[PDB]
Design a protein around this ligand. Sequence first.
Ligand SMILES: *[C@@H]1O[C@H](CO)[C@@H](O[C@@H]2O[C@H](CO)[C@@H](O[C@@H]3O[C@H](CO)[C@@H](O)[C@H](O)[C@@H]3O)[C@H](O)[C@H]2NC(C)=O)[C@H](O)[C@H]1NC(C)=O
Ligand SMILES: *[C@@H]1O[C@H](CO)[C@@H](O)[C@H](O)[C@H]1NC(C)=O
Ligand SMILES: *[C@@H]1O[C@H](CO)[C@@H](O)[C@H](O)[C@H]1NC(C)=O
Lengths: 48, 50, 48, 447, 49, 339, 100, 49
Amino acid sequence: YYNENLDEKYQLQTQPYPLILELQSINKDLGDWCPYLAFQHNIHSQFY
Amino acid sequence: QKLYNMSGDYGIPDLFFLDKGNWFTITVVLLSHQDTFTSSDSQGPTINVD
Amino acid sequence: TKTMITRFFQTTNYELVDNYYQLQKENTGLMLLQFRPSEFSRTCLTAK
Amino acid sequence: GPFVSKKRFYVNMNGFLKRDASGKSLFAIGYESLVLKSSHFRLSKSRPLWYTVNHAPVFILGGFYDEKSILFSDSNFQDYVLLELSIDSCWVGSFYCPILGFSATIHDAIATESTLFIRQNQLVYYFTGTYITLFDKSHGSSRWVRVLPSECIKRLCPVYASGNGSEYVLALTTGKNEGYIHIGTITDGLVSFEMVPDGWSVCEKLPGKNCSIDWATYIADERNLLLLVKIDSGQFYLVNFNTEFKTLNILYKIPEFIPEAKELDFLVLLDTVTYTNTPMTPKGLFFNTLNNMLYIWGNFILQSYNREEFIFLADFPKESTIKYMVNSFKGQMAVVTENEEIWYFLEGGYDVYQVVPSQGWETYHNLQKMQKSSFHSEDESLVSLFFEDGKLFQLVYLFDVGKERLVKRLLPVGTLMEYNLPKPFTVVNQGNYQAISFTHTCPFKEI
Amino acid sequence: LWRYYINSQDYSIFSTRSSIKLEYEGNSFVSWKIPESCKVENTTSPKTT
Amino acid sequence: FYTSDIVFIVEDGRILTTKAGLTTYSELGILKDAIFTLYYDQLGYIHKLTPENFDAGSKLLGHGNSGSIFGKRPDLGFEAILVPQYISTNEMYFFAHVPLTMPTNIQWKKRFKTIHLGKTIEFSKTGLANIKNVYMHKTEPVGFQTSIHTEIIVPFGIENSKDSPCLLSDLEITYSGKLYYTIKLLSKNPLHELKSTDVEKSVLIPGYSSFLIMNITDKWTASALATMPQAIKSNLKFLTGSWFLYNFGTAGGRKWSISTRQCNYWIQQDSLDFMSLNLVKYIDVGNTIDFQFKIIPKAMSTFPIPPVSMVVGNPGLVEVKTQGVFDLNENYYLDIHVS
Amino acid sequence: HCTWLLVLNKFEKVGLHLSKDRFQDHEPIDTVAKVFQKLTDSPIDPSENYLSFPYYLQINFSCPGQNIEELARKGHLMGMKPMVQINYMYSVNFYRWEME
Amino acid sequence: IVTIWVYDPESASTEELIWTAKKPSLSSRVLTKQMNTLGQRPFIFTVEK
Ligand SMILES: *[C@@H]1O[C@H](CO)[C@@H](O[C@@H]2O[C@H](CO)[C@@H](O[C@@H]3O[C@H](CO)[C@@H](O)[C@H](O)[C@@H]3O)[C@H](O)[C@H]2NC(C)=O)[C@H](O)[C@H]1NC(C)=O
Ligand SMILES: *[C@@H]1O[C@H](CO)[C@@H](O)[C@H](O)[C@H]1NC(C)=O
Ligand SMILES: *[C@@H]1O[C@H](CO)[C@@H](O)[C@H](O)[C@H]1NC(C)=O
């Protein structure tokens, strides 16, 4: 959040956003689900 | 006589003796419940069990 | 449970051939791979 | 053939016997001229069983009502005997220490390997048995030898472990040498006591006009000596004395009031806490050198990993005071209070479970009484309890008519924990009907 | 318009020992509505835990 | 000798069965014929012999079953009141109710006997348990003389709210005068009440004693007897959804039965020349013979106790050395050397 | 169910008494040489010297509902034999004895 | 040079939560040495190599 007319110490205030929890609340309202239990691999890198 | 290798009692031993760099290992096999893990546990390359 | 193991290799022999440097150049370069499940939807948090 | 369960017995060497002129075996420590009555156990309370852990061949239990008798047992109380001691019962008390009411009972019976110590009315006696597979024949004693003749002993404390091939005992004094305690060494059948804190008393290096020692544990490893000190006002200090060096350092200051925690199970005693109004009463301490664990007990349970930060285990109620505690040295601990109620602690968590007054004990007691057992009666009085290879035994007295007798008996804590019936459950729907399905509390099915 | 804050940016810490700060902005406000499992400190205030 | 079965024919036509070495028995069935005899052939099948009647069995399997001739396996349970009680999550007590002021000579109709040891108890609603011990106690608990310690497999069906409307209320159990127990319904709604058909029912709460509702003295008050009444010493109070009703009574039709269980053990033998059920082995002087068996348990297994008891007929001419170990999946391996 | 019973006997009172004798002798005694002089067809050389411990361990078992003697008779007649394992504990003085 | 200590988000200071702290607080220090007594030590593991 940005707002002028303040004491110069609060003109830029940062607040987190728990997107995962909001998405899970929406999904509980809706009722979708993941088709697989798990998907594992061993690609621990990006450039081989 | 004196027994050196026997098929006696098994299981864990009570007491261990170590001498300058020797080691030992144990294996714990855990049998989990029916639905302990859900699909939210698969976040990356391995499911976290902690 | 389905478990897949895949191996990447080349099968070229460079003995007794002509244009060794040209053949070497023709079998070099970059390529990109990605791994993903068959069908997936929301509520599935797997980074591909 | 038929199946008979595996059993373990102890066949240890008795060293306190002798033979008369007719060739009949007698006891060297006392006369077997007393017959067990039911008035021995009707009013007495339970007492601890003190011995060196894996090395004592003889078990002795003292603390009867008004007699100089002890319960003597070779083996592990599979059989016992009641010996009236041969103590001269002389009196040498005078004004040098305060005079208290005489009591012919035997207090603080300790049985170290090859030597057993007793206390009776501020006097300490020891007897050294003759063992040939341990040491020389001439080291054994012919009668009870009185140690510390010029000192008035208020308490005797045990050392469970052993270091440098020797055993140790502790004596806390009163009247004279208030800040000093005595450390007694047993080596090869020879005992010798030492005035440990040297010339200066420990009250000088500690706040208050004068100080009193209440309890002590001697760590033979590291040569440390941890001790509880009360001061003139009433605050308690846990302090440490080194034996190799001659130094002394304050380790902790016990709070006056217990901390409060409405729903927390463990509380780290920081410098910012909230106190209740009821006072604290530290009674004793216990050090385990296998896991470097320190316990302070009394009206509470304090647990320390190092000797700097302490944890209050809040499951123990503040209205119960721990009379004593025993340890299996394998991760389990039994706490016995003054109402004869028993609690169980496991070192892997932070919970203390009541076992003896409980539903599981009621179910187990009823099931034993309906299987026509011979160890269980409707009227019983706990005499003592101890550990044996990880199994918690208790020696108890059965008061029922026709079978008034002292028996040792298992206390299976796993069965009691399984039989504790009030547990979470759900009214599940199965087979187009309903059922009581108990929710699983363990995190894993099998190991 | 209301929201909730938690003390950790990581959500692999989020469990039953965490605290959730509920904040409401608006002219009209009566109370909070929670299940019987959860408790709220000072259930009439707009900024609560 | 094949299948090691034993059958006794007792007058009134009952047939008792067992296997050799076993210390229990079952009841195969009944047969009211005038003259008959029973015959086991080489393969283990059982025949009934009568003039112009050589019957082999209605249903025939691959192996030599001993109950082919009988139609349906009999119910081994009697007609009495069974009051249950939890002792753990998977263990249960059933108490048998002998009524008061009733004759001594006819007592045996309302008691658990030794036949029921090793059987299973089944409920018509749902549920199934296996009997593992039978206790007799004629004096200390009043109204109950025998009980069975069983292990729960399928966790039984509880009583509905439509058939019994007292469940939607708060209970209060107080000690009555001589030995009864007054059960009062705190909620005085005239919709709930206590119906007259709710007699000979068991009210239980998991964690306390169970009660058998014997008399109804009011529209919201019953009088009941208590199983193990020695652990109350107080007054009790419960909530709406914390206590449950069970109908194990004989009124309106008894709905519980006792019958034999299915096979629970497998014996694996990978070595040939030992697969026969009958074996004769010779040994000369000095020479020894050894054999090894595997036991796979299909159900809960005896972990400390080995599941095989072995006896030797004449031990004075033979020397038998046995080794036996368990496993993780609870398989049991044993080997025997004989000289 | 059925449980073991173990008692201590003297060397000269093996069958005469079934009561308890206490562990009072800590040296081995030499009343066994005459028996070993008669083992002429056994691999017992006269040069080696034998002498016995005092005391025996006497074992039976008891199981409720039956008496001890017929239980022992049945156990013998069915092939049963007790197996005994003795473990010794080392002393505190490791400066005079070894830890083994 | 990196300095590492352990902290609990429920009972840490306000500075340790906005990533502005320079010295561990009382709770963080006590928890850190209690974890060290049980034998816990951190290490930094590079990802690309
Ligand atoms: C099975 O073993 C037990 C012990 O290992 C035997 O029990 C013991 O039997 C003897 C009988 O000779 C009992 O001795 C009696 O002692 C009293 C008092 O000392 C004495 O007055 C009697 O004259 C007699 O000597 C002994 O008390 C008893 N011990 C126990 C613990 O019960 C038992 O006899 C053995 N069974 C068989 C069939 O041999
Ligand atoms: C010495 O300390 C004890 C308590 O340890 C106290 O009772 C006594 O009054 C003290 N002596 C003096 C002179 O204050
Ligand atoms: C109590 O039970 C007896 C015996 O069946 C019966 O005669 C009596 O009427 C009952 N009384 C009540 C109030 O149910």
